[PDB]
């Protein structure tokens, strides 16, 4: 299957009450493997997946060094962005950064990422060519010219197309029993009357990994996209995922509706009808 390694960083300024709260998390697909919290006691990058624990002290020293440096950059960026937007010194603001790489099922490099957000909105992002920048507004154009002069893209591209991808392949191997598995969803359907003429049919998908799934309803082979209540895919908390999809049907016409389940664990997609 397709795989990814992504790092996520969030810095939230708290003026008057000290230095910004910095949080860094690392993921291989939908599994977190590292973490850093500026308010935690260790002041170290810590393991979060059993397959990363086997890395020696030099690995953790380097990760702790680079993660504290990432946090310092964001601390300075918070002050700058406040000036770019003529914002008050007392308010709390957020910078977010995301970067990483993807590999296809052939394990060859597919995509690199490096993007930045200020206060939950796009600020600057590296384009798919790993050479150009997309600046969201006028303030981001100042940063864009600064990063072009400093040749930031040339440096990021060497990491994304090489280092990022080599370490992702090594993590996929070290964690092969969890990272390279497919848990097919366990499905069921519930039925609840809502009037003398209507009932809700809820199609369930549970204990699946990875999170990528399609759960849809049809009535006589026609998509029910508008009449479908769908929940966002949620973590079970044990490394698996859950999702449901519901439709309001006329009682007696339950057999005209089919729920369709699509997942890597299912060789052939599933068609499910209400079973009284």
């Amino acid at each position: 299957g397709s795989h990814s390694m992504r790092y996520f960083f969030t810095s939230v300024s708290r003026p008057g009450r000290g230095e910004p709260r910095f949080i860094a998390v690392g993921y291989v697909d939908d599994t977190q493997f590292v973490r850093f919290d500026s308010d935690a006691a260790s002041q170290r990058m810590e393991p979060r997946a059993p397959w990363i624990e086997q890395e020696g002290p030099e690995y953790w020293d380097g990760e702790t060094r680079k993660v504290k440096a990432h946090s310092q950059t964001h601390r300075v960026d918070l002050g700058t962005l406040r000036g770019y937007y003529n914002q008050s010194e007392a308010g709390s603001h957020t910078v977010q950064r995301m970067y990483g790489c993807d590999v296809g099922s052939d394990w060859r490099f597919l995509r690199g990422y490096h993007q930045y957000a200020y206060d939950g909105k796009d600020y600057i992002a590296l384009k798919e060519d790993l050479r150009s920048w997309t600046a969201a507004d006028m303030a981001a154009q100042t940063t864009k010219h600064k990063w072009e002069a400093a040749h930031v893209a040339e440096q990021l591209r060497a990491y994304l197309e090489g280092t990022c991808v080599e370490w992702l392949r090594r993590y996929l191997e070290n964690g092969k029993e969890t990272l390279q598995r497919t848990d097919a969803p366990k499905t069921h359907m519930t039925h609840h009357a809502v009037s003398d003429h209507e009932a809700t049919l809820r199609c369930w998908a549970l204990s699946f990994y990875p999170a990528e799934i399609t759960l849809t309803w049809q009535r006589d082979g026609e998509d029910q996209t508008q009449d479908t209540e769908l929940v966002e895919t949620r973590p079970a908390g044990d490394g698996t995922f859950q999702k449901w999809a519901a439709v309001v049907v006329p009682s007696g016409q339950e057999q005209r509706y089919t729920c369709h389940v699509q997942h890597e664990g299912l060789p052939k997609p599933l068609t499910l009808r209400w079973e009284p």
Binding site: G62, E63, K66, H70, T73, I124, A150, V152, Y159, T163
Partner: peptide, 10 residues
Amino acid sequence: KLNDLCFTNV
């Protein structure tokens, strides 16, 4: 592994 690069400020 994190990117071993001193980022440029905004």
